[PDB]
């Protein structure tokens, strides 16, 4: 039983090369300024990250 298996192969592009640092998701990743945050995480987080809803 070798360990060569069970390992994610290197990936440089596609949906499999980006994950939410806080959630680990694979879908709606925000890369606007290198946030690398999922949509839901960013929504729940914006007020305290310095972002504001002025209007």
């Amino acid at each position: 039983a070798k360990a060569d298996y069970n390992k994610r192969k290197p990936r440089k592009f596609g949906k499999g090369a980006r994950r939410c640092i806080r959630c680990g998701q694979y879908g709606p990743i925000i890369r606007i300024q290198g946030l690398m945050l999922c949509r839901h995480c960013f929504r729940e987080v914006a007020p305290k990250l310095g972002f504001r809803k002025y209007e």
Partner: protein
């Protein structure tokens, strides 16, 4: 000559640093170019509110504003030591270059 660029997310801290630099220049007696307010950088991110697909689509626009000021001074020993002795609050970023 020395060009200093100071940027922050807080206008009050921005103005505090600018006023400190102005006071240093005035006390040293060196002519100073007024603080140039560069255009504010507004990072806007629009996100869907719902975590699911059901319901009418609603969005929220989260905006982060960064304010920038520029100053130009003529290099001097005491003036530059005093400037390097600036408070530079946590939320303010300062860059100094020579020309």
């Amino acid at each position: 000559k020395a060009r200093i660029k100071i940027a922050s997310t807080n206008v009050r801290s921005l103005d505090e640093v600018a006023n400190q630099i102005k006071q240093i220049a005035e006390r040293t007696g060196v002519r100073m170019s007024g603080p140039i307010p560069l255009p504010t950088k507004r990072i806007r991110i629009t996100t869907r509110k719902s975590p699911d697909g059901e319901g009418s689509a609603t969005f929220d626009r989260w905006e982060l504003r960064v304010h920038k000021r520029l100053i130009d001074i003529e290099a001097d020993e005491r003036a530059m030591r005093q400037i390097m002795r600036i408070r530079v609050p946590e939320d303010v970023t300062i860059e100094i270059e020579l020309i």
